[PDB]
Design a protein around this ligand. Structure first.
Ligand code: HEM
Ligand code: HEM
Ligand SMILES: CNCc1cccc(-c2cc(C)cc(N)n2)c1
Ligand SMILES: CNCc1cccc(-c2cc(C)cc(N)n2)c1
Ligand SMILES: C[C@H](O)[C@H](O)[C@H]1CNc2nc(N)[nH]c(=O)c2N1
Ligand SMILES: C[C@H](O)[C@H](O)[C@H]1CNc2nc(N)[nH]c(=O)c2N1
Ligand SMILES: [Cl-]
Ligand SMILES: [Cl-]
Ligand SMILES: [Gd+3]
Ligand SMILES: [Gd+3]
Ligand SMILES: [Zn+2]
Lengths: 401, 401
């Protein structure tokens, strides 16, 4: 039982829940690969067996009537069909659980407040698009963001997968330039190219929202433009730096990850976009200041009159902090839910406590939980963490192209 | 079986073949990752053999002349005495290699530049004290700091240990009150309690330099007052916040770790204090701003008239950048060697590349290499890293009581 210390307080707990870690991660006793970003009917049965166990624990009916039947049902169905179907309530609980179990989500205090849209009856790319618009619409909620997920039909033998090719429902075009550079988001050069290849008429702005590439089973992907009024964006300004609005920067309201696979009791949902609300550092530090992203840090520091010729002046730190200020302020001004890294990490500390009393631990990826600026200013820095894989889960999956 | 290591800023890929050598098992298993945790007879011959084969290959002297020779005399030395003494050059090569291998050290680009004082003929606490004082005054060098390690005698059974009871050679006092709370440094409250418990007159202030507790073999330890002229300190002021000086903050010039156990060729020196120069975030972020440390963040923010009423003002972030600016400013004004986290991480990237060329990898603890402020602003953040144990090494060790 791994012992876990909080260095800010001296707290000490033992993560007994790690002992249930089913699937294996990348670390050995030889080498730690923690920092790496990217680490059969009977097995379907034990996964399903376990998840059903899980589900019946949660409804306080463990080992009860419905519990036995569901096991024998699932086994008979797996025997008969090679697979099985989740009941709707099992599906709501397996999507909440998969958010609960997501080691790299600091926003997991919210894991129970999750709106699950059952789209498992989806039939085409076109219906898929409609479900997705209603997800975006429900979640955005005019800026009062709501956590939601739409579960599209599960992988099953005989039919290809549903896939959202886009890594997120809202992404900014990244056009490779004349002179070898990128206009827009360099992280989205590939998906932009695929859109163009699939007949998207590209723009030439820095914040061109991408179309959706939606793959119905055994179909080429299909291109769907998002209605501009569905995609609530936030123009970026600074509460005191008034030249900041002249940078033309924007970010969108809704972080909806669309390329992850949702796993529940051995069943695989290759298309299940989920959305919450942003933590300002993702936008302010990562998205705008990563050297491989919008990379605005030097331009802001130059505009800020900072001395960018020496690193000891901390012009990077100063300019980044005001970019994050701008993001927070711009989102409050626009009445769009946003959580700063101080508030987010402090509720994650409550999550770890709730999770310790609830499950004897909580899977947590320190390098992803700790914010990318002001790390030790937040309490999660001084919290040791045990990272491991629980199921249900959101997993990475290969890109379908 | 060769870890793929990516850098996400550039896209470059390397493989850590060096990870194949890992001796002492790490804390991580396929089922859980514990990398974020801080403190997770003739066996001597295996480690002895390996270290000697290292040395000679490093001087391009594999399989010739003194190689087989030196192998015999340690085969004979252990045969006769059950231990062995290091050739002066080997103790130097082992000290440099331990530093080279310290995964958590971000300043290893400097690893080839190290001064080894040989205190292996040490006897009595009064002896170490002058050895330490020689080191200190050598390392300090009037502010133009020079890396140094003083290696005190190795370990043998039936004898006590050489131990410096302090964690560092320069540590600040920490005193309790009629209400438990601490004046001074709470990270040293315990050793501050020992120093008084061994007959030291306690001061009043928040920056009293503690006396050393030096321990000779099989002997209770002796108090030592460091020469005040030998403890180079930097009064902390801020380039443009004239009141920062008034806050009365200081830190010492020399970061000298005096509680880790140097381990070369299977020899264990429980007293081998090493020292370099600081990186400014050690002082300005961890030492002054950690809530369990000097915890000055809110004080500085009040003086800056920041809005401490809301977390989203990023007042914590703003006051922390300024505390770091003061540290860098004050050390530079005092002409004390110090390196900012940007310069430091950038050199570490340079180091990783050197080590990829030299030894095909570099053990690196991601969570300790990424600085505690402005993480993703430094390149090491975007660099994947592999953590493993190589020999020779610096190890943690129990408190000598
Ligand atoms: C409601 C507020 C939420 C907040 C504030 C939040 C915050 C975050 C942050 C900051 C990350 C790190 C991503 C990065 O740094 O690039 C993350 C990752 C993640 N989140 Fe949350 N999140 C929220 C909601 C959700 C929801 C609703 C789900 C699922 C239903 C979810 C599942 C995940 C997953 C699976 C990851 C890992 C994705 C990856 O590894 O790239 N999160 N979250
Ligand atoms: C010359 C400039 C140097 C710089 C800027 C530097 C910087 C650092 C920093 C920032 C850490 C993180 C420790 C913490 O934050 O608590 C560290 C750890 C460490 N350093 Fe270096 N260091 C330097 C030289 C050296 C030397 C000369 C040695 C030994 C010969 C050394 C050995 C270590 C070890 C063993 C650790 C890990 C200690 C632990 O885990 O507590 N460093 N260093
Ligand atoms: C820089 N963020 C990229 C990224 C990558 C992966 C996940 C997110 C995410 C997802 C959700 C549901 C909320 C949130 N706040 N973030 C974001
Ligand atoms: C707040 N850091 C405490 C700490 C803990 C452990 C080591 C250091 C250290 C050691 C050396 C040789 C240089 C340096 N710059 N740091 C510092
Ligand atoms: C290379 C390194 O692991 C990588 O940049 C990680 C570090 N920690 C992170 N943490 C979060 N939350 N998001 C990220 O994208 C990353 N990136
Ligand atoms: C809990 C966490 O592992 C712990 O606070 C570590 C994280 N990274 C660190 N990094 C450095 N350089 N120094 C530290 O003390 C720590 N503390
Ligand atoms: Cl994002
Ligand atoms: Cl220190
Ligand atoms: Gd103005
Ligand atoms: Gd006034
Ligand atoms: Zn690990």
């Amino acid at each position: 039982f791994p012992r876990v210390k909080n260095w800010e307080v001296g707290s000490i707990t033992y993560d007994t829940l790690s002992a249930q870690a089913q699937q294996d991660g990348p670390c050995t006793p030889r080498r730690c690969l923690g920092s790496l970003v990217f680490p059969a009917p009977e097995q379907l049965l034990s996964q399903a067996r376990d998840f059903i166990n899980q589900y019946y624990s949660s409804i306080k009916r463990s080992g009860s009537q419905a519990h036995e039947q569901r096991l024998q049902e699932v086994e008979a169905e797996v025997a008969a069909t090679g697979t099985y179907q989740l009941r709707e309530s099992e599906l709501v609980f397996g999507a909440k659980q998969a958010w609960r179990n997501a080691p790299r989500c600091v926003g997991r205090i919210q894991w129970g407040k999750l709106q699950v849209f059952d789209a498992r009856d989806c039939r085409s790319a076109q219906e898929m698009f409609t479900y997705i618009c209603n997800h975006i619409k429900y979640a955005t909620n005019r800026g009062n963001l709501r956590s939601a997920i739409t579960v599209f039909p599960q992988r099953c033998p005989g039919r290809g997968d549903f896939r959202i090719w886009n890594s997120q429902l809202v992404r900014y075009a990244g056009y490779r330039q004349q002179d070898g550079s990128v206009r827009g988001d360099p992280a989205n050069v590939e998906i932009t190219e695929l859109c163009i290849q699939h007949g998207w008429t590209p723009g030439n702005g820095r914040f061109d929202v991408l179309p959706l590439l939606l793959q119905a089973p055994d179909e080429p992907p299909e291109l769907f433009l998002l209605p501009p009024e569905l995609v609530l964006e936030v123009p970026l300004e600074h509460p005191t730096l008034e030249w900041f609005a002249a940078l033309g920067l924007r970010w969108y309201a809704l972080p909806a990850v669309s390329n992850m696979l949702l796993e529940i009791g051995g069943l695989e949902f290759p298309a299940a976009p989920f959305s919450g609300w942003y933590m300002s550092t993702e936008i302010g530090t990562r998205n705008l200041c990563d050297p491989h992203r919008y990379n605005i840090l030097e331009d802001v520091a130059v505009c800020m009159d900072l001395d960018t010729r020496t690193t000891s002046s901390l012009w990077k730190d100063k300019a980044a902090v005001e970019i994050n200020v701008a993001v927070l302020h711009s989102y409050q001004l626009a009445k769009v839910t946003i959580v700063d890294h101080h508030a987010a990490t402090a509720s994650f500390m409550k999550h770890l406590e709730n999770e310790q009393k609830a499950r004897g631990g909580c899977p947590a990826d320190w390098a992803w939980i700790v914010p990318p600026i002001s790390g030790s200013l937040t309490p999660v820095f001084h919290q040791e963490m045990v990272n491991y894989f629980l199921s249900p889960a959101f997993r990475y999956q290969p890109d379908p192209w």
